[PDB]
Short mmCIF file of C-alpha atoms and ligand atoms in Angstrom, two decimals:
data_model
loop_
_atom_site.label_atom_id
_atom_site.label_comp_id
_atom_site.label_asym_id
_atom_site.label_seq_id
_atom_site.Cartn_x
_atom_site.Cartn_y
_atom_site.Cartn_z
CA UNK A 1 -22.34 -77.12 62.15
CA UNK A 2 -23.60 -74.07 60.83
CA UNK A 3 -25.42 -74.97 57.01
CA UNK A 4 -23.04 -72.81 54.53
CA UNK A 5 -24.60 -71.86 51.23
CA UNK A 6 -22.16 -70.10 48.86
CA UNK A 7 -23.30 -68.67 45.25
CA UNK A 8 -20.38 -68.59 42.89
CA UNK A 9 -21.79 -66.27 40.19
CA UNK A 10 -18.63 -67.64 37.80
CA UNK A 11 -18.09 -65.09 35.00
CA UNK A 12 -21.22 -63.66 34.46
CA UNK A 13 -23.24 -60.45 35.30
CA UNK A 14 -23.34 -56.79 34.88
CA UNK A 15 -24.51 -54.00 37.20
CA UNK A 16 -27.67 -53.62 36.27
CA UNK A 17 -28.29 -57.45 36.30
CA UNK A 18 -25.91 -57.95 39.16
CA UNK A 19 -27.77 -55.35 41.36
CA UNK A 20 -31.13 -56.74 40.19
CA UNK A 21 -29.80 -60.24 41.86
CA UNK A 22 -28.56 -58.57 44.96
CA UNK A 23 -32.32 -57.60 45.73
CA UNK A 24 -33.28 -60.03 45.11
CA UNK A 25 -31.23 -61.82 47.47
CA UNK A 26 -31.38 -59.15 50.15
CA UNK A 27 -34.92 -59.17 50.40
CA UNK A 28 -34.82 -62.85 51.42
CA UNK A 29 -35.20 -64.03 54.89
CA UNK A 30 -32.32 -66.16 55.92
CA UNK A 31 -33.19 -68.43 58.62
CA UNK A 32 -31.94 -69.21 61.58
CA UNK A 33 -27.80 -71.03 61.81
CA UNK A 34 -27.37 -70.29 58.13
CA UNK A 35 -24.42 -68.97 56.41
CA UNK A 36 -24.95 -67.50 53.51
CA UNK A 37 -21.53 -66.25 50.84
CA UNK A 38 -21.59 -64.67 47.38
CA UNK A 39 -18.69 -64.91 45.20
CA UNK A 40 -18.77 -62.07 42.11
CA UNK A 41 -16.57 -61.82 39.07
CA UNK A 42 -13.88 -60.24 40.24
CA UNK A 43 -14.38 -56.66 38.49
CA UNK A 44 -17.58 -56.40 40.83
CA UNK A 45 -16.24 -57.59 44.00
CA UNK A 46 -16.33 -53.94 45.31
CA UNK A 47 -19.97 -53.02 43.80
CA UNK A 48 -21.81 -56.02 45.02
CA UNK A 49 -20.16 -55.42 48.34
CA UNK A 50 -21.70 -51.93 48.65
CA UNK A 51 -24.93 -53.30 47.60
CA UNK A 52 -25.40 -56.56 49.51
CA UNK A 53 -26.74 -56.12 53.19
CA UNK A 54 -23.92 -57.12 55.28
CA UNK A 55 -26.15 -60.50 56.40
CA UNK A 56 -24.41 -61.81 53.34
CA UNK A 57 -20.45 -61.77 52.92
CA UNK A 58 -18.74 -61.77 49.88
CA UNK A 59 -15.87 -64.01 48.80
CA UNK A 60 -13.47 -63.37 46.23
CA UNK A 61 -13.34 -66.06 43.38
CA UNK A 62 -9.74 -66.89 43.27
CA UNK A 63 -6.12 -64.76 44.12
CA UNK A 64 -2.67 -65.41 44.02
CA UNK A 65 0.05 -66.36 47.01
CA UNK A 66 1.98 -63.04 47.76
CA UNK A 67 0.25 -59.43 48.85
CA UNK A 68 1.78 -57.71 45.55
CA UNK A 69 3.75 -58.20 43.01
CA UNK A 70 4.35 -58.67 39.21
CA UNK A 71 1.50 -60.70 38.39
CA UNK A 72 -0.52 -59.17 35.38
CA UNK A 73 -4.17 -60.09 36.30
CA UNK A 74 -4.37 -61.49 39.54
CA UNK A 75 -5.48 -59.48 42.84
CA UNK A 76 -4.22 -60.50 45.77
CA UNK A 77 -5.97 -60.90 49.61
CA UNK A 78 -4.93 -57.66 50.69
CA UNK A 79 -7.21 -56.07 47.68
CA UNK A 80 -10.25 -58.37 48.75
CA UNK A 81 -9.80 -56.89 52.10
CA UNK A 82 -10.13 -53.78 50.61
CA UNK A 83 -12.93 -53.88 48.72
CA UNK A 84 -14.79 -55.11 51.86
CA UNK A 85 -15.10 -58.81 50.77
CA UNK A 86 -13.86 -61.44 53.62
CA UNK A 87 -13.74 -64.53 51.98
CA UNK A 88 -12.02 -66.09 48.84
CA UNK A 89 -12.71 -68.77 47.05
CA UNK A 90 -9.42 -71.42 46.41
CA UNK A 91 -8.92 -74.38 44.33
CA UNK A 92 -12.16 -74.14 42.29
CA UNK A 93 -12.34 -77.24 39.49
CA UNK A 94 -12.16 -74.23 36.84
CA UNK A 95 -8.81 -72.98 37.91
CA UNK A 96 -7.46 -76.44 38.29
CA UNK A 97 -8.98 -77.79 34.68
CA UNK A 98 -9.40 -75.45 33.10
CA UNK A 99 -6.32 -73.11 34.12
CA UNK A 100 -3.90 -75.31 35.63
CA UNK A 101 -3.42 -74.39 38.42
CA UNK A 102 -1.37 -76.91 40.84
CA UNK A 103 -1.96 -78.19 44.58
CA UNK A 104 1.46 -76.70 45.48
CA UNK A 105 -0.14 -73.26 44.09
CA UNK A 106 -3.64 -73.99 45.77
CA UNK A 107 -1.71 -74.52 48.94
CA UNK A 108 0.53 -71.74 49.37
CA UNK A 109 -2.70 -69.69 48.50
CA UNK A 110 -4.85 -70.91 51.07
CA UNK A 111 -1.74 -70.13 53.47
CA UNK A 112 -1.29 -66.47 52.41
CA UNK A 113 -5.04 -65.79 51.88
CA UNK A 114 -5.69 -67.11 55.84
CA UNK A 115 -2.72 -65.15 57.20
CA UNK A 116 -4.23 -62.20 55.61
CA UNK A 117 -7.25 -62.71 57.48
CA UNK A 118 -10.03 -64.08 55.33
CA UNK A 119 -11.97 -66.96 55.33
CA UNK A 120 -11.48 -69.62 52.24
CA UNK A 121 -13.74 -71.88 50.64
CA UNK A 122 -10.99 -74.29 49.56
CA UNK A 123 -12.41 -76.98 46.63
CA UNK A 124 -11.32 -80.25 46.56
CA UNK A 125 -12.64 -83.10 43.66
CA UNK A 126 -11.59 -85.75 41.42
CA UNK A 127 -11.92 -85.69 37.94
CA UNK A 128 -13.84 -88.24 35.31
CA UNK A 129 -10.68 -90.47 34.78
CA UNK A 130 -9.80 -90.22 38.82
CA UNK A 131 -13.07 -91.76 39.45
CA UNK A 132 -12.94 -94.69 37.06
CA UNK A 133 -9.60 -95.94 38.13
CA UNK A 134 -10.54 -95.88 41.55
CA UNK A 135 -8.99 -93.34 43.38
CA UNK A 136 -11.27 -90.73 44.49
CA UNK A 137 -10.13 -90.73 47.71
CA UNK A 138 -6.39 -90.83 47.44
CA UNK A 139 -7.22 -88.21 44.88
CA UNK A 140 -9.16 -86.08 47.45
CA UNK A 141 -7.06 -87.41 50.69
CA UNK A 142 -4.11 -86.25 49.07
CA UNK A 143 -5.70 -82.17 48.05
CA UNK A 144 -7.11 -81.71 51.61
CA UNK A 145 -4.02 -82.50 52.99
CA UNK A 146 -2.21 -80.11 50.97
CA UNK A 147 -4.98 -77.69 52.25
CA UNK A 148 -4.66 -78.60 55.76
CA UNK A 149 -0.90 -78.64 55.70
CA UNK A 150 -1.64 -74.54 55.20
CA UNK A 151 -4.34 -73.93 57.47
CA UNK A 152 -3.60 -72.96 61.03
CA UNK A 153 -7.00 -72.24 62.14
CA UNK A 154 -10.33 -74.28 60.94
CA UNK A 155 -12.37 -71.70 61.85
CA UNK A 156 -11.91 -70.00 59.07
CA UNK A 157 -12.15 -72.82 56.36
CA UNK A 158 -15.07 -74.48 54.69
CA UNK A 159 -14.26 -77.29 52.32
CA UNK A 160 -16.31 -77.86 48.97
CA UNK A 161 -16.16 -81.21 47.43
CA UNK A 162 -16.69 -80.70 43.79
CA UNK A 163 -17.62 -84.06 41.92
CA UNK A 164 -15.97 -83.02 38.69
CA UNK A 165 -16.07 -86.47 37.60
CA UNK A 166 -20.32 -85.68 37.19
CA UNK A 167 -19.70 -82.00 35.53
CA UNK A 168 -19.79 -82.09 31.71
CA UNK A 169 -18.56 -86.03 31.72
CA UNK A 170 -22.38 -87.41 30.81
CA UNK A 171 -22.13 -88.57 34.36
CA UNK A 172 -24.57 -88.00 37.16
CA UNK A 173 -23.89 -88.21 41.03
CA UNK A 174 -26.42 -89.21 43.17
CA UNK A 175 -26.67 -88.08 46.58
CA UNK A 176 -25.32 -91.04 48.05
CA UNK A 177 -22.13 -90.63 45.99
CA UNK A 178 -21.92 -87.26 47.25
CA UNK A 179 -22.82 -88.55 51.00
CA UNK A 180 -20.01 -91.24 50.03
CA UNK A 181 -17.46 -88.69 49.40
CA UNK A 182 -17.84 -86.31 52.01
CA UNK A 183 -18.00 -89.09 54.71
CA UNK A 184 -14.76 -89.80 53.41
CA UNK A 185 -13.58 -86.24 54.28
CA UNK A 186 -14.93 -86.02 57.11
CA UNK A 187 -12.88 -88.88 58.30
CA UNK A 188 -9.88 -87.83 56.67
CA UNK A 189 -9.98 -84.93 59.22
CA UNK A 190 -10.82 -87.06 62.02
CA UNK A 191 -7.94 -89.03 61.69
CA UNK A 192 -5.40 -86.72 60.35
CA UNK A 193 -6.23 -83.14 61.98
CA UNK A 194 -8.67 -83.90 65.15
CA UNK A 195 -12.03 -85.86 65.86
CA UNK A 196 -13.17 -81.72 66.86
CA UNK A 197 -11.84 -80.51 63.65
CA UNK A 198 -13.78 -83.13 61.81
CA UNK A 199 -16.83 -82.44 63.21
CA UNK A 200 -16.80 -78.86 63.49
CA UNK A 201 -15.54 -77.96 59.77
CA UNK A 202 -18.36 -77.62 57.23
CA UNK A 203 -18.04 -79.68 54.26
CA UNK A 204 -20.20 -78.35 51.59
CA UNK A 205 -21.24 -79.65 48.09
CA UNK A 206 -20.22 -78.09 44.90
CA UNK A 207 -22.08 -80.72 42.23
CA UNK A 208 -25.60 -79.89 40.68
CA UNK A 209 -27.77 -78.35 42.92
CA UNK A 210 -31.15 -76.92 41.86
CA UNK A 211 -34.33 -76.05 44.39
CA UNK A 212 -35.52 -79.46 43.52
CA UNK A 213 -32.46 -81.30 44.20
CA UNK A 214 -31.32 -79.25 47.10
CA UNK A 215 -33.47 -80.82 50.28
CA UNK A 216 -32.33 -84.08 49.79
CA UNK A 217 -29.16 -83.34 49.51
CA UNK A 218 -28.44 -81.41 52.37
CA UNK A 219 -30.73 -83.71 54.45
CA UNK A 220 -27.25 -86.26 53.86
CA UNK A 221 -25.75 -86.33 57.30
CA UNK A 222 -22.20 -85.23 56.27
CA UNK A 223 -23.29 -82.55 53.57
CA UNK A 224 -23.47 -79.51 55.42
CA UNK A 225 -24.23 -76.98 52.46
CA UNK A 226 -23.29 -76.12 48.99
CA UNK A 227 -21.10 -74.11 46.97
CA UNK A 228 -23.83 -73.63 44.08
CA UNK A 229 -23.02 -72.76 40.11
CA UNK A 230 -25.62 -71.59 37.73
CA UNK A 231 -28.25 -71.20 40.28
CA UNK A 232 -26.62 -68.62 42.25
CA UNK A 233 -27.67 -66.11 39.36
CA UNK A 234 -31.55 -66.88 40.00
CA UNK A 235 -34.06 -66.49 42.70
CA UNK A 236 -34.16 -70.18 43.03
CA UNK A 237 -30.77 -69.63 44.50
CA UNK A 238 -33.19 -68.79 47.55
CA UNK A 239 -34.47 -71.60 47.62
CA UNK A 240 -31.09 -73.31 47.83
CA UNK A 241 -30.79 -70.74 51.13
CA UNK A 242 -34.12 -72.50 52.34
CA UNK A 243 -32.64 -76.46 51.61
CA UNK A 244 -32.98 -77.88 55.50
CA UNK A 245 -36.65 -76.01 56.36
CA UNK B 1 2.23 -42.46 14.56
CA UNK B 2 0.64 -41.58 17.86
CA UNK B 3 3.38 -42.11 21.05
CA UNK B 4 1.93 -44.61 23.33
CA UNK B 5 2.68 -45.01 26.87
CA UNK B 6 0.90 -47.57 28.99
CA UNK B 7 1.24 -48.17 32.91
CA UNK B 8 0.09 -52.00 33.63
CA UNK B 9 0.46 -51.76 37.53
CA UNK B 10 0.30 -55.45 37.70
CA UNK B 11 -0.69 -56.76 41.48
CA UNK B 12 0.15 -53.90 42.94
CA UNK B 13 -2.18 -51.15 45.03
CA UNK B 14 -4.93 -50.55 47.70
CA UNK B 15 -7.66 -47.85 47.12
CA UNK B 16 -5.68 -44.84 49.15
CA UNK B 17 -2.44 -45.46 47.44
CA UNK B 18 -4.11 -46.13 43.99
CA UNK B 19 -6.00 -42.79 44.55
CA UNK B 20 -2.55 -40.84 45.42
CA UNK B 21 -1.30 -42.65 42.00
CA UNK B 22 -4.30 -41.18 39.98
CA UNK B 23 -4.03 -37.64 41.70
CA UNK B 24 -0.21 -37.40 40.55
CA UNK B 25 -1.00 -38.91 37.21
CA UNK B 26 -4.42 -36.24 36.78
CA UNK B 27 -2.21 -33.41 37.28
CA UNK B 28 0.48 -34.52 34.64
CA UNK B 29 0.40 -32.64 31.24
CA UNK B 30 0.25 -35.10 28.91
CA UNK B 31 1.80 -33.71 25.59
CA UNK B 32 0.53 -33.52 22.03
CA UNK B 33 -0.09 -37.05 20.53
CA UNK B 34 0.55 -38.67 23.21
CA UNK B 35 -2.12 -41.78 24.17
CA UNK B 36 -1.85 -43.00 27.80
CA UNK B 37 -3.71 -45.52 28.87
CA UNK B 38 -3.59 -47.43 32.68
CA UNK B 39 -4.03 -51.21 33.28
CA UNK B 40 -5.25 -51.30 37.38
CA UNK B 41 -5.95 -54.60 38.95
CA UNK B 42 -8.79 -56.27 38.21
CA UNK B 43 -10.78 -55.53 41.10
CA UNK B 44 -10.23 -51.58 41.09
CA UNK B 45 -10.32 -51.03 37.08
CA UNK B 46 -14.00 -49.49 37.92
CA UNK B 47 -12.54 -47.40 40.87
CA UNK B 48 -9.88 -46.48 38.62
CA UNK B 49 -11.99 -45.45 35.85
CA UNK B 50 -14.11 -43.47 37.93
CA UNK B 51 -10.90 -41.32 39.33
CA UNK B 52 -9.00 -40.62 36.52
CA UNK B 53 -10.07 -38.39 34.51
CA UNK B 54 -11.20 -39.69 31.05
CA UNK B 55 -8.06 -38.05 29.29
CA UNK B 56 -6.21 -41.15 30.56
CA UNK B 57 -7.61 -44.37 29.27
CA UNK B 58 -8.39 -47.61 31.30
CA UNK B 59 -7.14 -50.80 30.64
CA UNK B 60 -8.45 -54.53 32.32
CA UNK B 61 -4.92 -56.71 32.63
CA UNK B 62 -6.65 -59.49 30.85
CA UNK B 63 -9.91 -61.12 30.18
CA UNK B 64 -11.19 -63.87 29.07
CA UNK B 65 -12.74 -65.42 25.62
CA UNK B 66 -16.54 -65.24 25.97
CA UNK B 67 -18.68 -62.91 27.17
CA UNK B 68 -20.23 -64.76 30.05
CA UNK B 69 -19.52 -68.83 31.01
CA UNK B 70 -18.58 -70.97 33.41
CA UNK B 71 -15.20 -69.71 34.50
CA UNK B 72 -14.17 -68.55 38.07
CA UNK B 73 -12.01 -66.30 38.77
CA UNK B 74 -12.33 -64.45 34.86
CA UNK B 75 -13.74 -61.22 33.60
CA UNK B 76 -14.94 -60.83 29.96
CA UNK B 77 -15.23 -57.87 27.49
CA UNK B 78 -18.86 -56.69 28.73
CA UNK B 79 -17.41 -56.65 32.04
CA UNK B 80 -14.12 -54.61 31.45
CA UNK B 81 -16.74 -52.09 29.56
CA UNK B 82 -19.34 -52.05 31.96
CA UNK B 83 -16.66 -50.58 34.42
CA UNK B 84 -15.91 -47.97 31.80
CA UNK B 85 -12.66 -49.73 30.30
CA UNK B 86 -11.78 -49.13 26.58
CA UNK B 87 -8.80 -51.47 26.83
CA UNK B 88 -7.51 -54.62 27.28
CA UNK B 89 -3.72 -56.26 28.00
CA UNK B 90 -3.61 -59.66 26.46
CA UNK B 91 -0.55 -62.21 25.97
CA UNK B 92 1.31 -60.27 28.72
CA UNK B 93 4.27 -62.48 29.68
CA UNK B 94 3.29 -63.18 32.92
CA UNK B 95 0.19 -64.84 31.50
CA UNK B 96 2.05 -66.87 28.69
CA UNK B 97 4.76 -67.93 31.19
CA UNK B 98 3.56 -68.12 34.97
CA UNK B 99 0.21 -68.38 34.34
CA UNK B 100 0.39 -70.73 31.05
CA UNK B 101 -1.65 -69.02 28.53
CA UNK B 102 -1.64 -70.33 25.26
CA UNK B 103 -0.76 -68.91 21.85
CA UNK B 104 -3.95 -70.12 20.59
CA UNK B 105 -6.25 -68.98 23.55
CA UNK B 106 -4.69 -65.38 23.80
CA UNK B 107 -5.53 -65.29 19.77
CA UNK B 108 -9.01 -66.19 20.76
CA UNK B 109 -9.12 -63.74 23.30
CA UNK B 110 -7.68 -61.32 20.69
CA UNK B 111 -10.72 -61.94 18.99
CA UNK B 112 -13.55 -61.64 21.14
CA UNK B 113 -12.35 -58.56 22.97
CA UNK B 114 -12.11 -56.63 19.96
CA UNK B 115 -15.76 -57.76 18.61
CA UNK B 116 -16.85 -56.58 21.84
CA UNK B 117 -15.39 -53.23 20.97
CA UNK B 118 -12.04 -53.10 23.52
CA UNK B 119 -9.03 -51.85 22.12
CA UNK B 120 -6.29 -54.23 22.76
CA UNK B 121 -2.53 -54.10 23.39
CA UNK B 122 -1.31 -57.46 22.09
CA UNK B 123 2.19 -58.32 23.89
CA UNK B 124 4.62 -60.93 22.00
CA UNK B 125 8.16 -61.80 23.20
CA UNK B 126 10.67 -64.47 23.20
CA UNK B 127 12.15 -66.27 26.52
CA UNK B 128 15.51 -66.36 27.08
CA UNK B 129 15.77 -70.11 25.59
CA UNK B 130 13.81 -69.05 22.47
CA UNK B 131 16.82 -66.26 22.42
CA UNK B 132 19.69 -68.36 23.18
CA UNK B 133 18.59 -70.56 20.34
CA UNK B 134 18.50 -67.86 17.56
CA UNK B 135 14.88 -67.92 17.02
CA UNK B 136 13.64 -64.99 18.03
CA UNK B 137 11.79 -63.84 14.51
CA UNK B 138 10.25 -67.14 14.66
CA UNK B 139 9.11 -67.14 17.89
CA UNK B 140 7.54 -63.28 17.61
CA UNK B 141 6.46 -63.64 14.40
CA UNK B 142 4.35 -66.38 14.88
CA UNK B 143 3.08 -64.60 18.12
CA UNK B 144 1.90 -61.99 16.02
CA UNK B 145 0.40 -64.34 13.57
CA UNK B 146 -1.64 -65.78 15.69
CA UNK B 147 -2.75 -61.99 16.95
CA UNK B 148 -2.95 -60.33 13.42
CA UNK B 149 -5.44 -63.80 12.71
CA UNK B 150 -7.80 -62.37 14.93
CA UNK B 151 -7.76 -58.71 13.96
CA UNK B 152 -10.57 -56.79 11.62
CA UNK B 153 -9.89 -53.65 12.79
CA UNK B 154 -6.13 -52.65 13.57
CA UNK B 155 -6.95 -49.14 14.67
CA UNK B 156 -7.86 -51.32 17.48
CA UNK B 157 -3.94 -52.70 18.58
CA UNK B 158 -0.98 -51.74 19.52
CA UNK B 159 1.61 -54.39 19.83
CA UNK B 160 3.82 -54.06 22.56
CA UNK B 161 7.05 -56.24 22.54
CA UNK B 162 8.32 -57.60 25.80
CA UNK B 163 12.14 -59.13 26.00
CA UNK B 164 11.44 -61.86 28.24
CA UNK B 165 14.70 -63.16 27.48
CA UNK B 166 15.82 -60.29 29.49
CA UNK B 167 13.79 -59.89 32.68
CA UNK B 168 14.42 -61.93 35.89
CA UNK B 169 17.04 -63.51 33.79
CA UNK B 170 20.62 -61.80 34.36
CA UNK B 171 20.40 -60.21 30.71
CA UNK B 172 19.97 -56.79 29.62
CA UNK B 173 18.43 -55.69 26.46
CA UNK B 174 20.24 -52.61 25.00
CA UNK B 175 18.32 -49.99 22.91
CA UNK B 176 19.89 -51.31 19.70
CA UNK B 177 18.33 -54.61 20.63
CA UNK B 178 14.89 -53.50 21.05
CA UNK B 179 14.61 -51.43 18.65
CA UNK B 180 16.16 -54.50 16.03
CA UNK B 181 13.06 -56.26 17.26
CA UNK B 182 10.79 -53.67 16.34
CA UNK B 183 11.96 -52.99 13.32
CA UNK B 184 11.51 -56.80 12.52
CA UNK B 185 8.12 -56.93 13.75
CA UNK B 186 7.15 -53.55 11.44
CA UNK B 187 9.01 -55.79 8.72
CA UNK B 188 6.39 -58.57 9.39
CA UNK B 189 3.48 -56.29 9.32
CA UNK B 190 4.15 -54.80 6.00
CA UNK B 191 4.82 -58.36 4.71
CA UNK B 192 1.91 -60.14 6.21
CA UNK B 193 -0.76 -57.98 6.76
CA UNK B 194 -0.07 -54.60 4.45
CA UNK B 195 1.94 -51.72 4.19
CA UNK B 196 -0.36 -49.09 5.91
CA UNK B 197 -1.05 -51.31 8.60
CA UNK B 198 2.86 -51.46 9.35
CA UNK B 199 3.00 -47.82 8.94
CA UNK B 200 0.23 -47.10 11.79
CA UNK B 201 0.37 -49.69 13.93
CA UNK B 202 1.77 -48.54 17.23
CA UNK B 203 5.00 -50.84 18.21
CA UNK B 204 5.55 -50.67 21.90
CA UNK B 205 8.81 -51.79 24.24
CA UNK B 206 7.61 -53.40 27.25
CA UNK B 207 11.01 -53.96 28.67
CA UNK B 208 12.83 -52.26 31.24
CA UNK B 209 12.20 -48.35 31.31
CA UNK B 210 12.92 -45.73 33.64
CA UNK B 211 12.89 -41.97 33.38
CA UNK B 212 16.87 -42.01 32.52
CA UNK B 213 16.31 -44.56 30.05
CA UNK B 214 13.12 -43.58 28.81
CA UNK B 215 14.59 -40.77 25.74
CA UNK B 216 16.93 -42.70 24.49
CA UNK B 217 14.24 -45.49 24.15
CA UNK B 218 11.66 -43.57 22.55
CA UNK B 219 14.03 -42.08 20.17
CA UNK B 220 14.94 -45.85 18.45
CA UNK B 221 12.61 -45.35 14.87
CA UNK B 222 10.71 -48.21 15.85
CA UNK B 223 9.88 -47.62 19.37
CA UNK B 224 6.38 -46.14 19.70
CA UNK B 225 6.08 -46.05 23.34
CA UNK B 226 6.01 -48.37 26.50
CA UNK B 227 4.18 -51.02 28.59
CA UNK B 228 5.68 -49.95 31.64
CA UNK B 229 6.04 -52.37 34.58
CA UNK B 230 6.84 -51.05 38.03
CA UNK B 231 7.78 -47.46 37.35
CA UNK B 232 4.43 -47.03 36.25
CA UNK B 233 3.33 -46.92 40.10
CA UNK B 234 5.42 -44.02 40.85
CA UNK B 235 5.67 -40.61 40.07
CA UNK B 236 8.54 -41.02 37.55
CA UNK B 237 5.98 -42.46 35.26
CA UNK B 238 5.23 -38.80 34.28
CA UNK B 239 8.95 -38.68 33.33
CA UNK B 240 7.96 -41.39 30.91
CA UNK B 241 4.82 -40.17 29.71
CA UNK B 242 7.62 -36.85 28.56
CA UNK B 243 10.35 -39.67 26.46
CA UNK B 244 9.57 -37.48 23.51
CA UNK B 245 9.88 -34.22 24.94
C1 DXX C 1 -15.57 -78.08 34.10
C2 DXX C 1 -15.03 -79.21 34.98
C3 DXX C 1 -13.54 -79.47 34.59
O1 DXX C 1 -12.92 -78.38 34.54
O2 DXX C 1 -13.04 -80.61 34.36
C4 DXX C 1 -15.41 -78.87 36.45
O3 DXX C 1 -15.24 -79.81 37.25
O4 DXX C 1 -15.83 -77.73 36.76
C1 DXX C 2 8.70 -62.86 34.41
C2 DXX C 2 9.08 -63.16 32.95
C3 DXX C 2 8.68 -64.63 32.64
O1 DXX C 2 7.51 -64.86 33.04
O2 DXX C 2 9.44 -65.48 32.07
C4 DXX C 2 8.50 -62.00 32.08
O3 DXX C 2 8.93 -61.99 30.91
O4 DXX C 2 7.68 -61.18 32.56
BR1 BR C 3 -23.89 -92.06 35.80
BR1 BR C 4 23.53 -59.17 28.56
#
């Protein structure tokens, strides 16, 4: 499997900044079988497409279900087409906590965001209270399966386990929970998709990640990249690029 | 008072067909006191800007309550301005009622995109149970409560009054109706806030308008303009842009 490293930028930047950050990342080398996605706010989708070397794609950070419609704010795939990005983002912890949105939404998303031809980065976690009664994985079984239920071809899906149970909880996951969890996955899709869409589909890691966290976690033998926060914004995020050299 | 006419295209356009839009709505002659202002999607409000020639105003469809954080999928203040927006469309009914928004979030909203320097048009309406129930004033007063809270500077707003209670819903609102609203919410305004304010503050109807409908509409003493919906994507929104002629 190809190592995927995705920088969410989240709500933050400006053009001057956000350019400054885009040479910064084009000027680095990306080595060989690497993957590398950026994910702007979604005002700048367009701009940091024109300025990123197409060795990096751009994803979208969220849209909605149908190609247009009466739906003050959103953007839908078509539009990230558009503006030359090729991925979207789906399912984030932010638009589930935070916003509300549902698995039903999330899944007739992914549906209408594939059959419009991009790639998604569909994220998948369970939260603090999840975790403490036990049931991270019919928590997590039961979102991928809504995902998968929407997918008709794996090629063009990555799935991000975010441990939201370890972000702003006063709880840290080590990388054996992480390991633990995407193990789990992984065998999820073994057994309910197929053993070659188990091992072929990248399951990437959306907890802390920093340059000095970021070798040992992707040496785990079922974490196969990262979907990174605040780091994306910073040249360490190359380093993060760099995690299995 | 200055007439107001806004287009919020909602999810709706591509690049060519959003450029055809701005072409037709370049070559309009926008009449004396007259304000018009455009609400694109949120990933084309800098192409937008950039096309339409600054005596048409830009407008993000919403935003979000800080200026930078940890929130896929939202834009903020110095974002909408960076792309050379001077507005912002906040509390829009699609928000409050698909998308969940909170009276108390959209009044912090309020807040910080008006510190940051956007103009904002503030949208407040019942739903049709709110309606059926006789609570209307209650319900849009304390809408605009929660807006006028979070105001310093009301040469910033225009409130724009949407009958919720009468889209997607088999009702009709009738002239008289809307403009019995907007007389109450004026009514509230001189009450609550002053006078003057009540006096200048731009009341706009943000229910069904087309150019047949528009004149009789603009003509109710309360009525100070439109948030148009889907006619604003079409050439008729010129017709609208004329109510007062
Ligand atoms: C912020 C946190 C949550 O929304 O609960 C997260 O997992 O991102
Ligand atoms: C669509 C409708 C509602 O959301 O209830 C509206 O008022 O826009
Ligand atoms: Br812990
Ligand atoms: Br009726």
């Amino acid at each position: 499997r190809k190592f995927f490293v995705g920088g969410n930028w989240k709500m933050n930047g400006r053009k001057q900044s956000l350019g400054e950050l885009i040479g910064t990342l084009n000027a680095a080398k990306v080595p060989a079988d690497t993957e590398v996605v950026c994910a702007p706010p979604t005002a700048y989708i367009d701009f940091a497409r024109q300025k990123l070397d197409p060795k990096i794609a751009v994803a979208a950070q969220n849209c909605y279900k149908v190609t247009n419609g009466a739906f003050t704010g959103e953007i839908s795939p078509g539009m990230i087409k558009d503006c030359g990005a090729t991925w979207v983002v789906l399912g984030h912890s932010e638009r589930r906590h935070v916003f509300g949105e549902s698995d039903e939404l999330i899944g007739q998303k992914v549906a209408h965001a594939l059959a419009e031809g991009l790639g998604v980065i569909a994220c998948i976690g369970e939260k603090l209270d999840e975790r403490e009664a036990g049931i991270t994985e019919k928590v997590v079984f039961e979102q991928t399966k809504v995902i998968a239920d929407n997918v008709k071809d794996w090629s063009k899906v990555v799935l991000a386990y975010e441990p939201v149970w370890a972000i702003g909880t006063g709880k840290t996951a080590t990388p054996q929970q992480a390991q633990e969890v995407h193990e789990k996955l992984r065998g999820w899709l073994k057994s309910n998709v197929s053993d070659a869409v188990a091992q072929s589909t990248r399951i990437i890691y959306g907890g802390s990640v920093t340059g000095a966290t970021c070798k040992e976690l992707a040496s785990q033998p079922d974490v196969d990249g990262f979907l990174v926060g605040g780091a994306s914004l910073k040249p360490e995020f190359v380093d993060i690029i760099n995690a299995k050299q």
